[PDB]
Amino acid sequence: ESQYQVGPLLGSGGFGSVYSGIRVSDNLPVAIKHVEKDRISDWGELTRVPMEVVLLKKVSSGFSGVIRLLDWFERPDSFVLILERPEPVQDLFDFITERGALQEELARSFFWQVLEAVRHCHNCGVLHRDIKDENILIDLNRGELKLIDFGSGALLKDTVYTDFDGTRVYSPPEWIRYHRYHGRSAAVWSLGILLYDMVCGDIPFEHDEEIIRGQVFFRQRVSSECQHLIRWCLALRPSDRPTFEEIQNHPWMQDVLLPQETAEIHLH
Numbered sequence: 590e591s592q593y594q595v596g597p598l599l600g601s602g603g604f605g606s607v608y609s610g611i612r613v614s615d616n617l618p619v620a621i622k623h624v625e626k627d628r629i630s631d632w633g634e635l636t637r638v639p640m641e642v643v644l645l646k647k648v649s650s651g652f653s654g655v656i657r658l659l660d661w662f663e664r665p666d667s668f669v670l671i672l673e674r675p676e677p678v679q680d681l682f683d684f685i686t687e688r689g690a691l692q693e694e695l696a697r698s699f700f701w702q703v704l705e706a707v708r709h710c711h712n713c714g715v716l717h718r719d720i721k722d723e724n725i726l727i728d729l730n731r732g733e734l735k736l737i738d739f740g741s742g743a744l745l746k747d748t749v750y751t752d753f754d755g756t757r758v759y760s761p762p763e764w765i766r767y768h769r770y771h772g773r774s775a776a777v778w779s780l781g782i783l784l785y786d787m788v789c790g791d792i793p794f795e796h797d798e799e800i801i802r803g804q805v806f807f808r809q810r811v812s813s814e815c816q817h818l819i820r821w822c823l824a825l826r827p828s829d830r831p832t833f834e835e836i837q838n839h840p841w842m843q844d845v846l847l848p849q850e851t852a853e854i855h856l857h
C-alpha cells in the first residue's frame with residue numbers, strides 16, 4: 590500500500606494479475622500478485638486463506654528453488670501476495686519460444702533444478718500440481734530456476750486425488766481417463782512433458798488421445814539417454830514411472846552444471 594511501489598503488470602491469467610513491485614523498506618524487487626476471492630476454489634487455514642498461501646508458507650523457508658512468499662495481505666475481495674522477484678528474469682515458456690529446442694546440457698541443468706525444487710515442495714508436504722515451463726522462472730544472472738504458481742496445488746498425501754485444475758496437456762493419462770491420480774506419479778508425468786518440451790521446443794501432446802496413447806515422437810534430434818528418461822517419466826502405468834531418486838540417478842542426469850556455470854555458458 591505504502592510498504593510497496595507498484596510497477597508494470599507482468600501478466601494476468603488463471604493465477605491472477607501479477608505486478609512488478611519494489612519493497613520500499615529496502616528496495617527488494619518483489620512481485621505482487623492479486624488473487625480474486627471469488628475465483629478461489631480452495632481454502633485452508635493456520636482465519637481462512639487461499640490454499641495457495643498455506644502451500645507457499647510451507648515451502649517458503651530458505652531453499653530457493655521455489656519463489657518465496659514474503660508477505661500477504663487480505664482485502665475485501667481479494668488477497669494480495671508479495672513474492673520474490675529475480676531481476677533480470679524470464680519464464681521458461683518465453684525462453685523456449687526464443688531459443689527453440691534447448692541444448693541437452695542446458696535442459697539437464699534446468700531439469701535437475703526443477704527436480705530439486707519439486708523434491709523440496711514434497712519434503713514440505715506440498716504438491717504443486719501444475720509444473721510446466723510457464724510456471725518456472727529463470728533468474729538469468731544466477732542460472733537458477735524458481736517454481737511459481739501454487740494456485741492449483743494441494744497438501745501432499747498418499748491417497749488418490751480425484752480433483753485437478755492444473756494444465757491438461759501436462760496431466761497424466763490416469764487423470765484423462767479416470768479422473769484419479771496419485772501425487773508423485775502425476776508429478777513425474779508432468780516432468781516428462783516438461784523435459785520433452787525443453788529438448789524438442791514444444792510439448793509432445795496436444796489432445797487427450799495422444800496423452801492416452803502415450804506414444805512419444807521426437808521432432809528434434811535428442812540423445813537416446815534423454816529419450817529413454819522422458820519415456821520412462823511418461824510411462825502409461827503410474828507405478829512404472831521413476832521416483833525422483835531414480836530420475837536423478839538416471840545416466841542422462843549425471844554431471845549437471847551448477848546454476849552459476851549454467852548462466853555463464855548458456856545465458857550471457
Ligand SMILES: O=c1cc(O)c2cc(Br)ccc2o1
Nearest residue numbers: 607620656672673674737738
Ligand atoms: O506466483 C507468481 C506468479 C508470477 O507470475 C511471478 C512473476 C515473478 Br517475475 C515473480 C514471482 C511470480 O510469482
